[PDB]
Structure 1
Amino acid sequence: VAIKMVVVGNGAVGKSSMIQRYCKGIFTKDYKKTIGVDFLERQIQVNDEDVRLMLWDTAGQEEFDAITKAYYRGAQACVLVFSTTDRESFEAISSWREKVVAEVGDIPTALVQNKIDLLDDSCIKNEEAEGLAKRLKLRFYRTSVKEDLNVSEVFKYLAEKHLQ
């Protein structure tokens, strides 16, 4: 029993970091990276079952080539990510949603405001974020990959939603 999920959003919102935190338990400050993967994975327990979650980073690519389309193909859940400190990343969300729906249909999706550890100097107000989440009909999480807040919860919610 495997579940494929795509992580979707503008550059530098924390997508690859989110995947690395969830699958490996690590957060790297320096970002000095070397090797390419198409997905990471990890086992999760849901409704007394051993689910294999495979997380693909769609890397902010707006026009989908054959590789990008393969990233989206067979996606069973979607994480839409914006950054606390990047207003354009928040504004791009409704467009990203349309691209995801056009590509794969109406799969379980969550909206994530990442970098919430930096909330004291946020580019976006909670009321705006909740307002967008309501408009798009999406459960909203405020997340810190850096501090491991509301990362596991997002993927668990989506996995449960798919297996309901």
Structure 2
Amino acid sequence: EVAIKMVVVGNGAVGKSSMIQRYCKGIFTKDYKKTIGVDFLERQIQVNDEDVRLMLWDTAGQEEFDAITKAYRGAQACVLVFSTTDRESFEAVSSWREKVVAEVGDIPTVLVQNKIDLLDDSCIKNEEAEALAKRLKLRFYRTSVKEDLNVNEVFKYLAEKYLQK
């Protein structure tokens, strides 16, 4: 049995709260802004013959970039999220990465481009997202929380890397 605290980080409106609700509750609602009224949601899964309890902590956006918060404290893995339709959220990734490393150190991390169902309206070229992932040395996923596309894979990857580097 292992419990893993995972923090989901990135600019406002990229889909962090939706991603957590999708993974832990299996829902996607039509609201302009999602809310999680508790510190974290959780999902208990089996990974490589071990029982893992994933505790997914939501965060605030760039308006709280300098904030030192409970969601980051003792985080054991991290999802860095930007949005297909928000170039500023992509440009912010390196700053979010540096913030997490300075607060918790080196923890398993993945880079996620969410809202890939909106590719027609993309503001990020595929080559530049892949180039950033290679520069930060991070596994990169293109996700659609709305379509339940690659969400499960993100958390499974992080749990496996926590268990075996």
- TM (norm. structure 2) is 0.92
Deviations 1:6-65 (A, max 9, x none): 000000000000000000010011247676211000101111111100000122256568
Label 1:65 to 1:120 Cα distance change in 2 as closer, same or farther (>3 A). Answer: closer
Label 1:12 to 1:63 Cα distance change in 2 as closer, same or farther (>3 A). Answer: closer
1:5 corresponds in structure 2 to 6
Contact 2:17 2:34 in 1 (8 A): no
Q: 1:67 Cα deviation (Å)? A: 6.7
Q: Distance in 2 between matches of 1:90 and 1:57?
A: 19
Contact 1:61 1:68 in 2 (8 A): no
Contact 2:41 2:57 in 1 (8 A): yes
Contact 2:17 2:36 in 1 (8 A): no
Q: Distance in 2 between matches of 1:33 and 1:79?
A: 18
Contact 2:143 2:150 in 1 (8 A): yes
Q: Distance in 2 between matches of 1:35 and 1:112?
A: 20
Deviations 1:110-156 (A, max 9, x none): 00000000012201011010000011000000000000000000000
- Structure 1 portions without partners, runs of 5+: none
Label 1:29 to 1:117 Cα distance change in 2 as closer, same or farther (>3 A). Answer: same
Label 1:125 to 1:65 Cα distance change in 2 as closer, same or farther (>3 A). Answer: closer
Contact 2:76 2:107 in 1 (8 A): yes
SS in 1 for 2:112: strand
Contact 1:6 1:57 in 2 (8 A): yes
SS in 2 for 1:79: strand
Deviations 1:64-112 (A, max 9, x none): 6877145x11111000000000000000000100000000001000000
- TM (norm. structure 1) is 0.93
Cα RMSD for the two superposed structures? 1.8
Contact 2:75 2:104 in 1 (8 A): yes
Contact 1:15 1:59 in 2 (8 A): no
Aligned residues: 163
SS in 2 for 1:131: helix
